[PDB]
Ligand binder design. Structure first.
Ligand SMILES: CCCCCCCCCCCCCCCC(=O)OC[C@H](COP(=O)(O)O)OC(=O)CCCCCCCCCCCCCCC
Ligand SMILES: CCCCCCCCCCCCCCCC(=O)O
Ligand SMILES: CCCCCCCCCCCCCCCC(=O)O
Ligand SMILES: CCCCCCCCCC
Lengths: 385, 385
């Protein structure tokens, strides 16, 4: 839709790039030599463009490498089996059919391995190449020059797709990974404040994005290993793994925010009157946590190093003030008459679960800070000021 | 390989049925009327089998319908553009390429939409068909006649694939969803027992399987609405949705088990000598919860209605006993010296969060019992023996 396009103009550029590659191949085939067989080999290029044009440069390179491997191995095996069939002069079609059965069984069995559920697209091209070459080289024989001519057009289609994708506003998966790591910090910072305000009032996509994106940041890292150097990422081997290490460190913290959100939806809840006693300390703790997470996101975005001052001083002081406040008024959580109604006791005891989950969230930040200090060292981040 | 076959005879029969379909289409192509010039586009029949075989019957029917939609629509559009092109006799290649650019841009933009992301297979067929039938039907007036031949060989291949798939050893998605619900019930019971036993020592994939299976439980439901009646499920409109409703009540219960597992990996913990005071009540609560979950799983598996007895009496009584015990020994959770070391106070206050989360887990089971009764009435479950 128009709103979708205006919000993200990257997709419009990608669509116009694919349409331009198809237009170029079409123009060549329209104004090509009028040699015979034109309508036969013309379509192969325009149809491999639609198959090899991927969103990112690294996915294009990886998928075209696995597709070239599958096609070359299937064609070599098909030619070897076609030559071997001649020995069974009396039984030719029987041998060819039994080879098609064995190959189909083996490829279909190997694609089902748990460790190969990602590379099915190369097993399909393997089975297609073997069946096409075995069935299109029988009624005539000596089916070679044509299988060596079809690939000189598949190559042209892939060459024009690669040139158009790479040399006109390319999209790099490394920058996608960098911007996703920057986004997660702001999502978690918004969720924490939303949870505290919701509990103290007289938040889902935030931690959902940080918890549900583990595989996205691994596929982006798989694609980024093929791309050459560019921009600020100038090095033989950029440490892309420290980004995923810092993302895991942040996810370990986002699980506590998930538990704090789940406290609001519980069936058992504490009286609103007793919540207002501890309002100030909870608001200060949430404010300092959101400030620290936005500072770390801003320092990751600019590729800057940490300053000399301690970043955790204020949040630690706030958490110690909250602990003292809980200590002074603990008599509102339990009762002393029975010391030696179940619902009322559970409601009273459920406020200390919120306070303990907030103290544990403050306790888990040091690991994210250490991960950032490691990433700013492996990658030569700039000094501040 | 051998282990994946002996432990799963499904994946052997599937590969053998693919090989059988390929060898029947092959035998047909090979043994043909002496005149081979009657047809030369015979690989179109063998390449459809490799593209329209799926694990389940409902997936095959749904995907075949979505592929024939795009193919017929693209062929009609291409023939309309070809007929309208002859008006501009002077410029034919320019109009054709201006049509290809627009079609590629619209198909890519429409396939990048987030909502229509499960239908990416049907958007490539449209563009491929348009380009093939516009570049191949150039300088020819009988391409309309060619088209029908190509689709008659694609129809022969799809008919053979559907017959072989549906008449040898059908694999139904309805049974897959039915088995998945029972497996999630057993996983959640095992996780609850493991966490309660782990906290008292002198579990991980269980709740994870139940929490992350929503996409599978929705795709299987989408496939299951195409399949005809068979076996136990004998009705035109089987309430497959009530299974998803019960699985979502179970997910809402599993989130508390995840929060209980998070208490074992925390930086702040309570001394064991204080944990051992409440061992019996926690152990009884966990035993009763796991017995209730396994009873509901066993009644879902057998397709039987609930008896006249009350299922929740025992666990409710165990929870009441736990609450009374917490009331009696509450002086071990707070300190009365300062009523009016921070770490030791937090460690003491962290023991009550585990018990409050266990009480919330016990409180959330009534929704699951109500959803089970709703599914037991919507689908006619047999009365207990
Ligand atoms: C083969 C060289 C290029 C590489 C191909 C990529 C291989 C990787 C695997 C992907 C799938 C196989 C490749 C497919 C390539 C291909 O050529 O495939 C192009 C398509 C099939 O594409 P798919 O293989 O993706 O399904 O072929 C056709 O559809 C042509 C059939 C003729 C259309 C006639 C329609 C009849 C309509 C009658 C008129 C009435 C209309 C009424 C309207 C109202
Ligand atoms: C989806 C169908 C795609 C087309 C599949 C057939 C293409 C044939 C291309 C042959 C590739 C080259 C094989 C070389 C084998 C060799 O020389 O040993
Ligand atoms: C020669 C390259 C392409 C060969 C044909 C590949 C298979 C094309 C399948 C198109 C989708 C047809 C699925 C529906 C068929 C039907 O409804 O019977
Ligand atoms: C249709 C599959 C094409 C496989 C080749 C991919 C591009 C590399 C050509 C050398």
């Amino acid at each position: 839709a128009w709103e979708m396009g205006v919000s993200d103009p990257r997709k419009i550029v990608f669509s116009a790039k694919i349409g331009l590659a198809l237009t170029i191949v079409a123009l060549l085939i329209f104004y090509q030599e009028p040699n015979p067989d034109l309508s036969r080999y013309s379509v192969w290029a325009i149809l491999t463009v639609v198959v090899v044009f991927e969103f990112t440069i690294g996915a294009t390179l990886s998928k075209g490498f696995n597709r070239a491997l599958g096609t070359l191995s299937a064609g070599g095996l098909a030619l070897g089996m076609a030559e071997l069939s001649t020995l069974f002069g009396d039984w030719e079609e029987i041998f060819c059919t039994l080879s098609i059965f064995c190959i189909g069984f083996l490829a279909t069995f190997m694609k089902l391995y748990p460790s190969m559920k990602a590379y099915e697209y190369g097993f399909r091209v393997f089975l297609l190449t073997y069946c096409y070459i075995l069935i299109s080289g029988f009624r005539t024989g000596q089916f070679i020059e044509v299988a060596i001519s079809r690939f000189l057009l598949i190559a042209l289609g892939a060459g024009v797709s690669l040139g158009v994708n790479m040399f006109i506003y390319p999209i790099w998966a490394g920058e996608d990974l960098h911007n996703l790591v920057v986004k997660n910090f702001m999502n978690v910072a918004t969720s924490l404040e939303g949870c505290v305000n919701g509990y103290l009032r007289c938040v889902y996509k935030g931690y959902r994005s940080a918890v549900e994106s583990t595989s996205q940041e691994e596929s982006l890292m798989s694609f980024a290993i093929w791309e050459p150097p560019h921009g600020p990422y100038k090095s033989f081997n950029y440490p892309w793994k420290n980004y995923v290490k810092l993302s895991g460190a942040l996810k370990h913290c986002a699980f506590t925010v998930m538990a704090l959100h789940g406290c609001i939806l519980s069936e058992i809840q504490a009286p609103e009157e007793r919540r207002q006693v501890f309002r100030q300390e909870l608001q200060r703790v949430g404010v300092e946590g959101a400030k620290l997470l936005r500072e770390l996101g801003e320092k990751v975005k600019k590729m800057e190093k940490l300053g000399p001052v301690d970043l955790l001083f204020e949040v630690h002081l706030a958490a110690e003030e909250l602990q003292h406040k809980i200590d002074k008024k603990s008599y509102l959580l339990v009762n002393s008459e029975c010391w030696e109604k179940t619902y009322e006791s559970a409601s009273a005891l459920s406020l200390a679960t919120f306070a303990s989950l907030l103290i544990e969230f403050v306790a888990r930040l040091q690991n994210v800070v250490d991960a950032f200090k490691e990433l700013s060292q492996k990658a030569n981040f700039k000094e501040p000021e």
